[PDB]
From Swiss-Prot:
Belongs to the DNA repair metallo-beta-lactamase (DRMBL) family. It is found in: Nucleus. Coiled coil: none annotated. May be required for DNA interstrand cross-link repair. Also required for checkpoint mediated cell cycle arrest in early prophase in response to mitotic spindle poisons. Possesses beta-lactamase activity, catalyzing the hydrolysis of penicillin G and nitrocefin. Exhibits no activity towards other beta-lactam antibiotic classes including cephalosporins (cefotaxime) and carbapenems (imipenem). Binds constitutively to TP53BP1. Binds CDC27, which is itself a component of the anaphase promoting complex (APC). Binds PIAS1. Induction: During mitosis. The mRNA encoding this protein contains an internal ribosome entry site (IRES) in its 5'-UTR. This 5'-UTR generally suppresses translation while specifically promoting expression during mitosis, when cap-dependent translation may be impaired. This is DNA cross-link repair 1A protein. Expressed in brain, heart, kidney, liver, pancreas, placenta and skeletal muscle.
């Protein structure tokens, strides 16, 4: 059944709750972003109102074939009324189209639902600065102090410098980047930019990217693999067997592959820095795991919550085990006692 952490009290609303059939008492289904664990269940047969960003609406229409009459896109940073309730959509700094949602309940309670987010100090100057938030529905993916990772900028600088060096030493090296969803487009676009190439990909992935309102996108991507020296493949193909196989397909145009797997966290983060990362190598193939995160580190999450000072926190991630729930509750109490709210 629909879990309580997916329901907004005092409303008929639900958030990211499309796999339970008809939720009794739901008048509007919000969708924070186009990731499959969140949209699971949507299709062309859905006949209730879906509220979301413009970009998420583009993907629902073109990729899932949801009918236009049920898609309700909202602009960001704008007070909107939905079924008699004031709401605002904020940029979540996750993947393209991803939002946080502010609900203003008729009784005066203000609720923030973060969706999936990477907390940033820039959020402290959004419309969130303007009133008190009583209840926070929080993306707790990395809520434990072992989870450190570098800035996105630092990671992109490493990837750009590595690729440019490799290809300038060997003009017959191919760069391959893995993907299994939207997000992390900066990794492959930044590398293609330094190399003066477009990125080449399947027809399905090109279609997905043409939904994202990325400026000058026609200048940066292509379905013609032969003309491109940055290829995107399914994350599943980023291993030595999959990459050897891919290299056969290019007809002796290339004699070396340098591949990037943008992971979330990996336990080499507790010891090693970004400057010190090394690849796994077999023969003429090298694979780099780079810690490019679209979720809060522990310290980013803690700073956001200690700034916001909510009265009650409702985790939305890692809620399935008692040991996870208890650990998270301990951190929330620590944060509250340190900051004095
Ligand atoms: Ni997500």
């Amino acid at each position: 059944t629909c879990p309580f952490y997916k329901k907004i009290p005092g409303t008929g609303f639900t958030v990211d709750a499309f796999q339970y059939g008809v939720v009794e008492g739901c008048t509007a289904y919000f969708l924070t972003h186009f990731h499959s664990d969140h949209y699971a269940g949507l299709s062309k047969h859905f006949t209730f109102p879906v509220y979301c960003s413009e970009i998420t609406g583009n993907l629902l229409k073109n990729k899932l074939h949801v009918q236009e009459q049920y898609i309700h896109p909202l602009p960001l940073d704008t007070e909107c009324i939905v079924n008699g309730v004031k709401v605002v959509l904020l940029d979540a700094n996750h993947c393209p189209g991803a939002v946080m949602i502010l609900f203003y309940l008729p009784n005066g309670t203000v609720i923030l639902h973060t969706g999936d987010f990477r907390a940033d100090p820039s959020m402290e100057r959004s419309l969130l600065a303007d009133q008190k938030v009583h209840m926070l529905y929080l993306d707790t993916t990395y809520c434990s102090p072992e989870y450190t990772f570098p800035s996105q900028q630092e990671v992109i600088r490493f990837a750009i410098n590595t690729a440019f060096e490799a290809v300038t030493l060997n003009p017959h090296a191919l760069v391959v980047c893995g993907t299994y969803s939207i997000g992390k487009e900066k990794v492959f676009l930044a590398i293609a930019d330094v190399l003066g190439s477009k990125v080449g990909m399947s027809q399905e992935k090109y279609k997905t990217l043409q939904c994202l309102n990325i400026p000058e996108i026609n200048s940066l991507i292509t379905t013609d693999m032969c003309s491109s020296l940055v290829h995107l493949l399914p994350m599943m193909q980023i291993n030595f067997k999959g990459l050897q196989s891919h290299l056969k397909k290019c007809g002796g145009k290339y004699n070396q592959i340098l591949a990037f797997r943008p992971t979330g966290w990996t336990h080499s983060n507790k010891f090693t820095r970004i400057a010190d990362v090394i690849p796994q190598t077999k023969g003429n193939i090298s694979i780099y795991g780079i810690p490019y995160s679209e979720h809060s580190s522990y310290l980013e999450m803690k700073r956001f919550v200690q700034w916001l000072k909510p009265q009650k926190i409702i985790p939305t991630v890692n809620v399935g085990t008692w040991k996870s729930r208890s650990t998270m509750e301990k951190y929330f109490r620590e944060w509250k006692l340190e900051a004095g709210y």
